[PDB]
Amino acid sequence: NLYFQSNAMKTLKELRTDYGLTQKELGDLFKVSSRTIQNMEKDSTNIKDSLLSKYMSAFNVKYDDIFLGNEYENFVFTNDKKKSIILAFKEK
């Protein structure tokens, strides 16, 4: 279980969607193209700190709160997150 094993709480995509910002709105907010946001949401493995820091700043989160990884890892992570909640709830 990846979400439970992790200090991370959110993916890049989740930080964005939590406020229903479009990739385009977020690009304009962070001074990079949409395609940069697409790419970083697909695979965060090589994200530049200059960009990571804007995420931490805009969304008031710490480095540890953010999940970083490739498309596969993001999936296992979010997927695992959903099951956690379901399973915790069912434990009563």
Residues that bind its own copies (CB under 8 A): 1-2, 4, 6-7, 9-10, 14, 17-21, 25, 29, 54, 57-59, 65, 78-79, 81-82, 84-86, 88-90, 92
Cβ closer to its own copies: 46 or 79? Answer: 79
Q: What is the DSSP string of 6-62?
A: -S--EEHHHHHHTTT--HHHHHHHHTS-HHHHHHHHH--TT--HHHHHHHHHHTT--
Nearer to its own copies by Cβ, of 51 and 54: the residue is 54
Report in angstroms how near the CB of residue 56 gets to its own copies at its nearest.
11
Nearer to its own copies, 29 or 50 (CB): 29
Q: Rounded to the nearest whole angstrom, what is the least distance from the CB of residue 45 to its own copies in the complex?
A: 21
Nearest partner of 4 among 91, 88, 81, 92, judged by Cα: 81
The nearest distance, CB 39 to its own copies, in angstroms, is 20
**Cα torsion 47, 50, 51, 53: sign:** positive
Beta bridge partners of 11: 67
